[PDB]
Amino acid sequence: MKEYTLDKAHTDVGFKIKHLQISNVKGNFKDYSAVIDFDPASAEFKKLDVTIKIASVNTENQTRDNHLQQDDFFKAKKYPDMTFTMKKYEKIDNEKGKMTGTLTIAGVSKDIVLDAEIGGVAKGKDGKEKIGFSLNGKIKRSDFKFATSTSTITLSDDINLNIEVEANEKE
Amino acid sequence: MKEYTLDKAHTDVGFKIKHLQISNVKGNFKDYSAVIDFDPASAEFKKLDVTIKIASVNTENQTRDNHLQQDDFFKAKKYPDMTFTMKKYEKIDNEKGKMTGTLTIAGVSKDIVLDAEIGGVAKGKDGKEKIGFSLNGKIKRSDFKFATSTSTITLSDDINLNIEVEANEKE
Amino acid sequence: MKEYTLDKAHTDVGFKIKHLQISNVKGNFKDYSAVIDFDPASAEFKKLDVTIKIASVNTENQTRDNHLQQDDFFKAKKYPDMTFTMKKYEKIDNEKGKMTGTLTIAGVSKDIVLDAEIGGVAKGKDGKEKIGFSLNGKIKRSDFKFATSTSTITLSDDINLNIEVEANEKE
Amino acid sequence: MKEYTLDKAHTDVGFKIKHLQISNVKGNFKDYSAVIDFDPASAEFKKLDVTIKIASVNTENQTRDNHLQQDDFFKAKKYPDMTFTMKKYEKIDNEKGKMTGTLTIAGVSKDIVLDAEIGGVAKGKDGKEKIGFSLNGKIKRSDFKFATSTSTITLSDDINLNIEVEANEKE
């Protein structure tokens, strides 16, 4: 036999251990349209109908975005857009209200509630109206049979909607 | 009432969804010592005893490294080093053998098997010996009651040892 | 050499694979008290203050219940009760309202909103009042620095409150 | 307004929280065949070829078993059987050896090592041979592109093989 001394410079005393990390995917959509009717005299929404081009998703990552279009997510070939249609606005006060509407994702429809929070009602520089409001609320993937193949473990059953809107009077 | 048109430039149609991601933590130790007895005539290890300074862990991230020293991981104040002591080497052939030894982590001891893979036996430039070998094997956190507070979900019960050694003859 | 034939009766061609499963822990509390002021003329809550004896938790499992009392959950020795104090009731209509109050868990306090849903307002057999309502809402463990040691992976950051109340007039 | 007292008997102060639980799926196969050549003089395997009817899986649960046959697992319509073919047996001693072979799952093939552990070599009541051995080892789903759709989070990349064999001499 024979004795050796490590060469610390070309020796690695190494280990690998697997762990999980929870993180939020944040995303918007670049391309959508809305029809907004609002009465600044009473701080009530009268009609709110949004259509979102699924195609235009942006989670700040190209490969995931493309993946979102596929059969196991949006199926944008078949169902190119998601729609929201307001059915009812219940004023709480001038800053706050409960908004009820029909959300349609990949052809499945469910009535959801969003929390309307009016961040500002104004008359502009030019004497024409402005508003700034937010719509917030949790929807469940399962309620829309959305991404059924993906486990509620890997990806949460809960999506959190945060629609932040600035908007000016028409014509 | 009154009609508005979104200002696309100050409107975000946004969502947040939580997901899990699996990843490997890879780490070595900067500071360790070893005693290596090997017989290049028969490709057998005769004695292999390593001591690793827990303090010197490096997972390429400072905040985790410091955290590894704490009570819920290594407890480096109380147990500053981990030790491996070979008990038995069973040659398979000149490239391969089963190494049995006692691993001690934070004062708990268990007999583990590593797979010896001899990457090269040589005589150096100067006519003095060299060897290059690896030791590989899976150990279970649970077997060493290590990081008991951390769930086997978050952090895997399995640690994978990959000890890569270059070493030269002594004196 | 020699040839053999399996004894199918004492042969197991076996495998073990680890998987995760998501499930809800459901629980109530056996022991709590409440003070309830309500105006059946206007369907408004006037005062609603609840105190819950942490000790009396019941998740239909004894070992978990005991565990819930410990330092890494409720710390029932130090903080024996959780309290809810209503601060504001905003009527939506006679069936629905937004309730705002202060929740206190292990000495940490946060203002939460619950969704009041009045399931029934009545005059009893005896001509004395009754009500049946529910309070629902999501609270975040993190907002109350509750069970900080447990990862948001293993146990969800979201707790869902479902307070189902039947109640009769006093004196 | 008016004051009420809870009816503790029809009041639930309730909560629901989601958590993950890790567990092992254990399974065998009811229907398989093997060809076993072994030399009790030298405790060496000479030939070991197994074929397993995927159809006959049993994880003590019918709905999962059926599911295992489907496209996202075994695809038993296309690939009805899994095969193991020994390529090399390296004796360690009479109780232990390293077995190398080709595992084929759903038409994908990889060379794996199992740890042979000979639990007993005998001559029977009738003077004809017996053996009892085990084969153990970890295989990676990813190495066989098996259940590619299922995340390594939900279901572990590691399957642990435990083949427990009793067997008697032929003819």
Q: What is the DSSP string of A120-159?
A: EEEE-TTS-EEEEEEEEEEEEGGGGTTTTTS-TTTEEEEE
Q: How far apart are CA D150 and CA D146, in angstroms?
A: 9
Place of tokens 């390429």: B60
Q: How far apart are CA B73 and CA A58, in angstroms?
A: 39
Residue A15 lies in a domain: no
Give the residue from A87, A108, A82 showing the smallest Cα distance to A98. A87
Cβ-Cβ contacts under 8 Å for A27 (sequence gap 6 or more)? A57, A58, A59, A60, B14, B15
Backbone angles phi, psi at C112, to 5 degrees: -115, 160
Cβ contact, residue pair B154, C149, below 8 Å: no
Residue C98: list chain A partners with CB under 8 A. 92, 96, 98
Backbone angles phi, psi at B164, to 5 degrees: -105, 115
Cβ contact, residue pair C92, A93, below 8 Å: no
Q: How far apart are CA C64 and CA C52, in angstroms?
A: 18
Cβ contact, residue pair B155, A40, below 8 Å: no
Please name the residue of chain A whose CA is at the shortest distance from the CA of residue C113.
A115
Which two three-digit tokens encode residue C13? 């061609």
Domain that holds residue B105: 22-171
Rg (CA), chain C: 24
Which two three-digit tokens encode residue B60? 């390429």
SS3 sequence of A22-84:
EEEEEEEECCEEEEEEEECCCCEEEEEEEEEEHHHEECCCHHHHHHHHCCCCCCCCCCCEEEE
Which two three-digit tokens encode residue A77? 């070939």
Residue D55 lies in a domain: yes
Give the residue from D154, D139, D137, D136 showing the smallest Cα distance to D72. D154
CA distance D145 to chain A (A): 18
Distances (CA, A) of A57 to A69, A73, A82, B5, D170: 9, 12, 11, 21, 66
Q: How far apart are CA A26 and CA B13, in angstroms?
A: 11
Residue B89: list chain A partners with CB under 8 A. none
Please name the residue of chain D whose CA is at the shortest distance from the CA of residue B157.
D22
CA distance C20 to chain B (A): 8
Which two three-digit tokens encode residue B64? 């985790």
Cβ-Cβ contacts under 8 Å for C144 (sequence gap 6 or more)? C103, C105, C106, C108, C110
Residue D96 lies in a domain: yes
Which two three-digit tokens encode residue C143? 């907002």
Residue A40: list chain B partners with CB under 8 A. 2
Q: How far apart are CA A52 and CA A32, in angstroms?
A: 4
Give the residue from B19, B16, C156, C22 showing the smallest Cα distance to A159. B16
C137 neighbors C158 (Cβ within 8 angstroms): no
Backbone angles phi, psi at A71, to 5 degrees: -50, -30
**Helix, coil or strand: residue D9:** helix
Give the residue from C163, C147, C72 showing the smallest Cα distance to C112. C163
Backbone angles phi, psi at B92, to 5 degrees: -95, -60
Burial state string for A91-114 with b = 16 or more CB within 10 A and e = fewer than 16: bbeeeebbbebebbbbeeeeebbb
Q: What number of other Cβ atoms are within 10 A of residue B171's Cβ?
A: 5
C122 neighbors C129 (Cβ within 8 angstroms): yes
B89 neighbors B99 (Cβ within 8 angstroms): yes
Q: What type of residue is A83?
A: T
DSSP tag of C92: S
Residue C92: list chain A partners with CB under 8 A. 90, 92, 98
Residue D138: list chain B partners with CB under 8 A. 138
CA atoms within a 13 Å half-sphere pointing along the CA-CB vector of A63: 0
D119 neighbors D134 (Cβ within 8 angstroms): yes
In chain B the first and final C-alpha atoms are separated, in Å, by 94
Q: What number of other Cβ atoms are within 10 A of residue D20's Cβ?
A: 21
Residue A76 lies in a domain: yes
Header resolution in angstroms: 2.6
Q: How far apart are CA A33 and CA A50, in angstroms?
A: 6
Give the residue from D168, D170, D136, D135 showing the smallest Cα distance to D48. D135
Cβ contact, residue pair B152, D22, below 8 Å: yes
Residue A50: list chain B partners with CB under 8 A. 13
How many domains does chain B fold into?
Answer: 1
CA distance D109 to chain C (A): 18
Residue D2 lies in a domain: no
Q: Which residues pair with B134 in a beta bridge?
A: B117, B164
Q: How far apart are CA B115 and CA D100, in angstroms?
A: 15
Question: For the domain that residue D74 is a member of, what is the CATH number?
Answer: 2.40.128.110
Instruction: Kindly tell me the sign of the dihedral angle through the C-alpha atoms of D27, B155, C154, A152.
Output: negative
Cβ-Cβ contacts under 8 Å for D119 (sequence gap 6 or more)? D132, D133, D134
Residue B93: list chain D partners with CB under 8 A. 90
Cβ-Cβ contacts under 8 Å for C20 (sequence gap 6 or more)? A153, B153, D20, D21, D22, D153, D154, D155
Q: How far apart are CA D74 and CA D81, in angstroms?
A: 9
Distances (CA, A) of C8 to B130, C18, D131, D165: 51, 26, 13, 8
CA distance C143 to chain D (A): 15
Residue A144 lies in a domain: yes
Cβ-Cβ contacts under 8 Å for B20 (sequence gap 6 or more)? A20, A21, A22, A153, A154, A155, C153, D153
Cβ-Cβ contacts under 8 Å for A22 (sequence gap 6 or more)? B18, B19, B20, C151, C152, C153
Cβ contact, residue pair D11, C37, below 8 Å: no
Cβ-Cβ contacts under 8 Å for D130 (sequence gap 6 or more)? D120, D121, D122, D123, D124, D166, D167, D168, D169
Residue C133 lies in a domain: yes
**Pairing of β C12-29 and β D44-53:** unpaired
In the A/C pair of chains, how many CB contacts fall below 8 A? 24
**Helix, coil or strand: residue D22:** strand
Q: What type of residue is D140?
A: K
Residue C146 lies in a domain: yes
Q: Which of B21, B90, B153 is opposite residue D22, by nearest beta carbon?
A: B153
Q: Which of A50, A129, A166 is opposite residue B7, by nearest beta carbon?
A: A166
Q: What is the DSSP string of C26-71?
A: EEEES-EEEEEEEETTTTEEEEEEEEEEGGGEE-S-HHHHHHHHST
Cβ contact, residue pair B11, A164, below 8 Å: yes
CA distance A39 to chain C (A): 19
Method: X-ray
C14 neighbors C92 (Cβ within 8 angstroms): no
Q: What type of residue is B15?
A: F
Burial state string for C45-73 with b = 16 or more CB within 10 A and e = fewer than 16: beebebbbebbebbbeeeeeeeebeeeeb
Q: What is the DSSP string of D40-74?
A: TTTTEEEEEEEEEEGGGEE-S-HHHHHHHHSTTTT
Q: What is the DSSP string of B51-75?
A: EEEGGGEE-S-HHHHHHHHSTTTT-
Place of tokens 């006093």: C170
Q: Which of B4, B5, B25 is opposite residue A19, by nearest beta carbon?
A: B25
In the B/D pair of chains, how many CB contacts fall below 8 A? 24
Please name the residue of chain A whose CA is at the shortest distance from the CA of residue B150.
A19
Select the residue from C72, C140, C141, C154 to test the B interface by mutation, using most B Cβ atoms within 10 A: C154
Which two three-digit tokens encode residue A63? 């490969």
Longest CA–CA span in chain C (Å) reads: 96
Q: How far apart are CA B54 and CA B106, in angstroms?
A: 9
Residue spans of beta strands (DSSP E) within chain D: 2-6, 12-29, 32-39, 44-53, 57-58, 81-91, 96-105, 108-123, 129-140, 155-169
Q: Which residues pair with D90 in a beta bridge?
A: D98
DSSP tag of B7: -
Which two three-digit tokens encode residue D7? 């009816």
